[PDB]
Structures are given as structure tokens and as C-alpha cells.
């Protein structure tokens, strides 16, 4: 992510040591995990340089709750998106529905690229900000 060491601290995966004694090939040992539930670890996460400790693949978070789908309505934050989850609410008395929605702020790994539209799949993780409880797990750029 654009000279990844672009913050005031050194950005690195914790407990992942690049031993300078050993003359290995990559010299930049990168940790990653299979998030589970049939979500493929992207090749961008596999071979990236970003750190993003909140990534479902190269980070310290886990996907263990509800799996939601939504439409990206905002990408204006850094590593965070807001997805719109439209649904119809039933009113029994009128036997009819009314359109409702709930914005869900979702953390997006740099492994993914998202824009407005771009129906995404998000998995519940632990709270990673005041409002964010979900992480992008499939981009599905529909």
C-alpha cells in the first residue's frame, strides 16, 4: 500500500520475523490464513505488501458471525466502506411492505478493490472501531 511504512510506526505482522541471518528467497516472510466458510483467500492478500492488522486473511481478526450482503454506497474513508442493506419490512395490518435500509460500516482489506455499487459480502468480526463489526470477505463486483 504505497510504501507500506508510510506511518509513524513500523508496519509489520506481529510475531513474524524476517531473520537477516538466513539467506532465504523472499526475505519478506508474509503470514496469511484461510478465513473459512468457503471464502477464498485472495492472491492480493497472499502476495501483498500491506499490513492491515484488521484483514480477515493477513490480519488478527476472525470471521465468526453473521454473513451479510450489501451494496457499497461510500468508500470515502481509509480501509472502511459503508454498505447499504435494503430490505422490505412487512406491516401486518396492511398486509404490505415498505422499503427500509440499514447502512453497515465495513472494514475492507487492501486485498480487495471496491467502488460504489460493487455488491460485497461481509462477515461479522470482533468490534474493530466504534461502528464497524464486519469485514469484506468477497468483493463480487456486480
Amino acid at each position: 500500500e504505497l510504501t507500506v511504512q508510510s506511518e509513524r510506526a513500523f508496519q509489520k505482522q506481529p510475531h513474524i520475523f524476517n531473520n537477516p541471518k538466513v539467506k532465504t528467497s523472499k526475505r519478506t516472510k508474509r503470514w496469511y490464513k484461510n478465513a473459512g466458510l468457503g471464502f477464498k483467500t485472495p492472491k492480493t492478500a497472499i502476495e501483498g505488501s500491506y499490513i492491515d492488522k484488521k484483514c480477515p486473511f493477513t490480519g488478527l481478526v476472525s470471521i465468526r458471525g453473521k454473513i451479510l450482503t450489501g451494496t457499497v454506497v461510500s468508500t470515502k474513508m481509509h480501509r472502511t466502506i459503508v454498505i447499504r442493506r435494503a430490505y422490505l419490512h412487512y406491516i401486518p395490518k396492511y398486509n404490505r411492505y415498505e422499503k427500509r435500509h440499514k447502512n453497515v460500516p465495513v472494514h475492507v482489506s487492501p486485498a480487495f478493490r471496491v467502488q460504489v455499487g460493487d455488491i460485497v459480502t461481509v462477515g461479522q468480526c470482533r468490534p474493530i472501531s466504534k461502528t464497524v463489526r464486519f469485514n469484506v470477505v468477497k468483493v463480487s463486483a456486480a
Binding site: A9, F10, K12, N18, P20, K21, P105, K130, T131
Partner: protein, 184 residues
């Protein structure tokens, strides 16, 4: 006291939340340790569940690991040179996780000489075996000539009462040297 609750800290829509449930003990915060250097003073904090935390005030020595030889020698902290979160912590020499400190480097000097013995910066044939692995980074060995090794604090002195850490190496070391040359 300090609350970590979210009943204050108004909702994401910007609405001011009404009060209910006056501050609860299970959501309390406490004041920062603000660990200083020298003349060790560790205070015990009785935490939730009957457990105990250790506020380290004025810590002098800590255990620092090289992680290239796996030694983790105990050394004395010279001072703080860089802090990614607050320059005032550097100015006041506050010991804190991720703080870049200087360690005495003398225990590491002794261990390197007693283990490999190859005049790092100025039972007989064990060095004959472990001589090929005696080369170390120029940017690490150059620090011994001044007797100050750059290190990063990895423990939380306000939580555990210890000031353990690791010696900076490789890309992390180079990054922190570049920041030091830019800010000094």
C-alpha cells in the same frame, strides 16, 4: 471514575444519547502509568476478578531479545529516542510499548564475545563451529562502537510492570534510523 462505556460518545448518526445506568464499575478506566526511567517503583493494582496488574513507574532495567541469536539479555535502558504516538513521550522519557529506547549493549557484547568471539566492534573450538554465523548487520554492529543499541519496547509497563523489548534489526531498524535522521 474514567468510563470505557459507550453510552456517552454520541451515536453514529450524531444523536446525543440520553443518560441511563449511572457509571458502572465493570466499565471503569484508570489513569496511565506514565512510566519513567530509573529507580524502579512498581505499584500493584487490584483488578477485576481478584487479579493484579503492575503499574511500573520509573523503570530502570528490562529484558531485551536480539531475536537473531535468541538470547534475551537483561540490560539497562539509556533513554527514549522515538515514539510513533507522541513526541512528548520522547521528551519526558516515558516508557511505553512500541517506544524506541537505547540499551546499554554491554550484556550483548559479553554474550557475543563469550559465544562467538570475533571482535564485534571493539570448549576451545566451539567458535570454529559457530564462526560462519558470526557476521551481523553493519547497522547493528556500528551501535556497539558507541555502546548504545536501539530497541523497541514490546511489553506494556503500565499493565505488566516489565519493560521487555527487542533489538531493532533489518528493515525495522532502517526505518527507525531514517526517522531519527529526519527528526534529528
Amino acid at each position: 471514575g474514567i468510563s470505557r462505556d459507550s453510552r456517552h460518545k454520541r451515536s453514529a448518526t450524531g444523536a446525543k444519547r440520553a443518560q441511563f445506568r449511572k457509571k458502572r464499575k465493570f466499565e471503569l478506566g484508570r489513569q496511565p502509568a506514565n512510566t519513567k526511567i530509573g529507580a524502579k517503583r512498581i505499584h500493584s493494582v487490584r483488578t477485576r476478578g481478584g487479579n493484579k496488574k503492575y503499574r511500573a513507574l520509573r523503570i530502570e532495567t528490562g529484558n531485551f531479545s536480539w531475536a537473531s541469536e535468541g538470547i534475551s539479555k537483561k540490560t539497562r535502558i539509556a533513554g527514549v529516542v522515538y515514539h510513533p504516538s507522541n513526541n512528548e513521550l520522547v521528551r519526558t522519557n516515558t516508557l511505553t510499548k512500541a517506544a524506541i529506547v537505547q540499551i546499554d549493549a554491554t550484556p550483548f557484547r559479553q554474550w557475543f564475545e563469550a559465544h562467538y568471539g570475533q571482535t564485534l566492534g571493539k570448549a576451545e573450538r566451539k567458535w570454529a563451529a559457530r564462526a560462519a554465523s558470526a557476521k551481523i548487520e553493519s547497522s547493528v554492529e556500528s551501535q556497539f562502537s558507541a555502546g548504545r543499541l536501539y530497541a523497541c519496547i514490546s511489553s506494556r509497563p503500565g499493565q505488566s510492570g516489565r519493560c521487555d523489548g527487542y533489538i531493532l534489526e533489518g528493515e525495522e531498524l532502517a526505518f527507525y534510523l531514517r526517522r531519527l535522521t529526519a527528526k534529528k
